[PDB]
Amino acid sequence: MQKHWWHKATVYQIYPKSFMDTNGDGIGDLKGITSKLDYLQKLGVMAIWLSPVYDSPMDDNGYDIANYEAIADIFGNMADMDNLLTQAKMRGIKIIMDLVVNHTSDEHAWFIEAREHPDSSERDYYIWCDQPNDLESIFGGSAWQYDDKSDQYYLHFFSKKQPDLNWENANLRQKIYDMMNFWIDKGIGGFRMDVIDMIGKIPAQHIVSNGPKLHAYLKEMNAASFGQHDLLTVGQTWGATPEIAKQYSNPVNHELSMVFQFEHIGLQHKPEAPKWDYVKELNVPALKTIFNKWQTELELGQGWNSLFWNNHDLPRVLSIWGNTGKYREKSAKALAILLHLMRGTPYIYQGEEIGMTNYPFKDLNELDDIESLNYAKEAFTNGKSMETIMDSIRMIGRDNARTPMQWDASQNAGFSTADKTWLPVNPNYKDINVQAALKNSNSIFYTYQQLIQLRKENDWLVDADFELLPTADKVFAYLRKVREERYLIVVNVSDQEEVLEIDVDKQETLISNTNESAALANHKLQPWDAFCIKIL
Ligand SMILES: [Ca+2]
Ligand SMILES: [Ca+2]
Ligand SMILES: [Ca+2]
Ligand SMILES: [Ca+2]
């Protein structure tokens, strides 16, 4: 397998509204990010996945873009973006921009012209229909919005203010590529592609994800933009299987570097049940099956895995799968160790490295996310009390991932000087903040730092295979093997003491959140015990 820079990289996701505010409007901005670049360099990440900072009415907080080549006023201006690029560059960090091209804002020039002049070219940049089908929006209701003026429905798989782009239109695709090249020329490190597996959609045939033209489109995109360069491209692919992932990430296909798959995320809810009907306890054997499948199927020189627990769309991993009480730190370290020592590119969401958690939202009025609010509006009329709804949202709502980054124990956790922040700061900031984590030599932060440096400095994290070991249900254990080198990873994914009936010759300890020697000797694991040891 040909090696690229990003094979040694760890990616850090920044949610711009919630990272750092430098002008007291209670909203994060570019200058804040740039101001915290040294912190990010100390962590050791090689790239920043920056969630959208483009011009946007913020109805889906950036993922409804009105101008792909302008910065939203709330984040600053283009000068701030350039400065972010240059400073990050100076600190050895690349910027990965969020590419959102399945849809635009309804306030994009293209759609405004599409409505103004129905005979214009950009009218066909979108998907118009006289006779709509039963396709639903992801945010509830019909995926077809009737337009009084032109008397046609336009397609939107998300919000009504996010009309879908017509990817059957080659001119539209071309303008997308022009824009992508605009950003490539500015010196970005790559693209994260929002719901990219949807661009092959054929709504008339009820085809949404994994459409027949999808990979042709991705090949065309590659050829027309980032292909010649040496960038990291990661696609968000809800409907991805390991085979489809092979199609995406095998370099000979000339498409993407890797994709985000969500099979493990599916364990956060019951099969075929809405995500709001959340699962209470992590099914560790199920996770074993899923992770093992993705590790073994995506062989080397055949595809590349992405590794993540959580993002701006998901609950923080501690709240849904970890421990938020007595074993918060230890469980956080355990999950970090478990994920990062597999093969692939790991992604750290902001605050994950200090063990931030979900927020205890009290009512709908505190919420911002359109998905949660729409869900609430529908659920309240279909037999669910507001408290039930708020419970589900408290566990699964996207706003849980979007509370302000917790930097210290000062006002608003040092995120802002404003009286109020756009989302409330979690009260646990007095115990859970960056300053305290940096001060604590054995904090979650330094576990993440160690993992990152391990990946940066050791080829076996890339080269070695994966073998799942037969263990107790809640014990996640595997071997990474390369040449004669054997690396054992053991993680007790539970609040309970578990048995460890293996006998090995420990050569050395690479990382551990506990007494690995005592665990091996007594053949038992304390709750959330996690270590990696090189064995004979
Ligand atoms: Ca601000
Ligand atoms: Ca009319
Ligand atoms: Ca103030
Ligand atoms: Ca210290």
Measured in Å, residue 417 CA sits from the centre of ligand 1 at: 10
Supply 521's token pair.
């000797």
* Cβ atoms of 6 and 307 closer than 8 Å: no
**Can you tell me the distance from the alpha carbon of 22 to that of 30, in angstroms, rounded to the nearest whole number?**
9
**Can you tell me the distance from the alpha carbon of 309 to that of 349, in angstroms, rounded to the nearest whole number?**
8
Tell me, rounded to whole angstroms, the distance of Cα 439 from its chain centroid.
27
**Can you tell me the distance from the alpha carbon of 413 to that of 428, in angstroms, rounded to the nearest whole number?**
10
Domains and CATH numbers, the chain: 1-104+170-464 (3.20.20.80), 105-169 (3.90.400.10), 465-536 (2.60.40.1180)
Burial level of 157, CB count in 10 A (0-12/13-18/19+)? buried
Measured in Å, residue 443 CA sits from the centre of ligand 4 at: 9
Supply 40's token pair.
């990010």
> What angle do the packed helices 30-43 and 444-457 form, to 10 degrees?
70
Measured in Å, residue 402 CA sits from the centre of ligand 3 at: 21
- Give the count of beta carbons closer than 10 Å to the beta carbon of residue 290: 17
Measured in Å, residue 289 CA sits from the centre of ligand 3 at: 51
Measured in Å, residue 157 CA sits from the centre of ligand 1 at: 30
Bridge-based pairing of strands 524-525 and 152-155 is unpaired
Closest CA to 235 of 49, 3, 17, 12: 49
**Can you tell me the distance from the alpha carbon of 349 to that of 204, in angstroms, rounded to the nearest whole number?**
37
CA angle 7, 13, 18 (to 5 degrees): 170
Measured in Å, residue 503 CA sits from the centre of ligand 1 at: 55
**Can you tell me the distance from the alpha carbon of 401 to that of 268, in angstroms, rounded to the nearest whole number?**
15
Closest ligand to C-alpha of residue 410 is 3
**Can you tell me the distance from the alpha carbon of 199 to that of 202, in angstroms, rounded to the nearest whole number?**
9
Which residues contact residue 409 at a Cβ distance below 8 angstroms, ignoring those fewer than 6 apart? Answer: 429, 430, 433, 435, 436
Supply 484's token pair.
């004669």
Cα dist from 336 to 88, 94, 341, 451, 530, whole Å? 24, 22, 8, 8, 9
* Cβ atoms of 197 and 214 closer than 8 Å: yes
Rg (CA), the chain: 23
Measured in Å, residue 129 CA sits from the centre of ligand 2 at: 14
- Give the count of beta carbons closer than 10 Å to the beta carbon of residue 527: 19
Report the run of H or E that residue 48 belongs to, with start and end: strand 47-50
**Can you tell me the distance from the alpha carbon of 509 to that of 197, in angstroms, rounded to the nearest whole number?**
41
Report the run of H or E that residue 67 belongs to, with start and end: strand 67-71
Closest ligand to C-alpha of residue 418 is 3
DSSP reduced 3-state for 95: strand
Burial level of 504, CB count in 10 A (0-12/13-18/19+)? middle
For the sheet with 306-308, list strands across it. Answer: 258-260, 232-236, 190-193, 94-99, 47-50, 11-14, 345-349, 306-308
**Can you tell me the distance from the alpha carbon of 156 to that of 419, in angstroms, rounded to the nearest whole number?**
37
Measured in Å, residue 154 CA sits from the centre of ligand 2 at: 14
Measured in Å, residue 22 CA sits from the centre of ligand 3 at: 11
Measured in Å, residue 34 CA sits from the centre of ligand 3 at: 22
User: Scanning the structure block, which residue is given the tokens 């873009």?
Assistant: 65
**Can you tell me the distance from the alpha carbon of 164 to that of 102, in angstroms, rounded to the nearest whole number?**
6
Measured in Å, residue 448 CA sits from the centre of ligand 2 at: 57
* Cβ atoms of 366 and 360 closer than 8 Å: no
- CA-based torsion, 96, 100, 106, 109: positive or negative: positive
For the sheet with 485-492, list strands across it. Answer: 467-468, 475-482, 485-492, 530-535, 506-512
Closest ligand to C-alpha of residue 148 is 2
Measured in Å, residue 206 CA sits from the centre of ligand 2 at: 27
Measured in Å, residue 526 CA sits from the centre of ligand 2 at: 68
**Can you tell me the distance from the alpha carbon of 329 to that of 530, in angstroms, rounded to the nearest whole number?**
12
Closest ligand to C-alpha of residue 26 is 1
Measured in Å, residue 151 CA sits from the centre of ligand 2 at: 5
For the sheet with 128-129, list strands across it. Answer: 128-129, 152-155, 144-147
Q: Given in angstroms, what resolution was this structure solved at?
A: 2.1
Measured in Å, residue 150 CA sits from the centre of ligand 2 at: 6
**Can you tell me the distance from the alpha carbon of 385 to that of 391, in angstroms, rounded to the nearest whole number?**
10
**Can you tell me the distance from the alpha carbon of 163 to that of 58, in angstroms, rounded to the nearest whole number?**
14
Closest CA to 14 of 347, 395, 236: 347
Measured in Å, residue 418 CA sits from the centre of ligand 3 at: 4
Burial 126-140 (b: 16+ CB within 10 A, else e): bbbeeebeebebbbb
Q: What technique was this entry resolved by?
A: X-ray
Report the run of H or E that residue 498 belongs to, with start and end: strand 498-499
Measured in Å, residue 172 CA sits from the centre of ligand 2 at: 27
Measured in Å, residue 138 CA sits from the centre of ligand 2 at: 26
User: Scanning the structure block, which residue is given the tokens 């950036």?
Assistant: 62
- CA-based torsion, 427, 430, 432, 434: positive or negative: positive
Which residues contact residue 244 at a Cβ distance below 8 angstroms, ignoring those fewer than 6 apart? Answer: 197, 210, 237
- Give the count of beta carbons closer than 10 Å to the beta carbon of residue 59: 18
Measured in Å, residue 53 CA sits from the centre of ligand 1 at: 12
Cα dist from 11 to 1, 83, 90, 190, whole Å? 21, 20, 17, 11
Supply 318's token pair.
């501690």
**Can you tell me the distance from the alpha carbon of 423 to that of 400, in angstroms, rounded to the nearest whole number?**
9
- Give the count of beta carbons closer than 10 Å to the beta carbon of residue 170: 11
Closest CA to 214 of 179, 191, 240: 240
Closest ligand to C-alpha of residue 21 is 1
**Can you tell me the distance from the alpha carbon of 96 to that of 232, in angstroms, rounded to the nearest whole number?**
8
Bridge-based pairing of strands 152-155 and 94-99 is unpaired
**Can you tell me the distance from the alpha carbon of 30 to that of 19, in angstroms, rounded to the nearest whole number?**
9
DSSP assigned state of 46: S
DSSP reduced 3-state for 87: helix
Residues near ion ligand 3 (Cβ under 5 Å):
417
Closest ligand to C-alpha of residue 146 is 2
Supply 348's token pair.
């750290």
Burial 91-115 (b: 16+ CB within 10 A, else e): eebbbbbbbbbbbbbbbbebbeebb
**Can you tell me the distance from the alpha carbon of 19 to that of 350, in angstroms, rounded to the nearest whole number?**
8
Measured in Å, residue 77 CA sits from the centre of ligand 1 at: 12
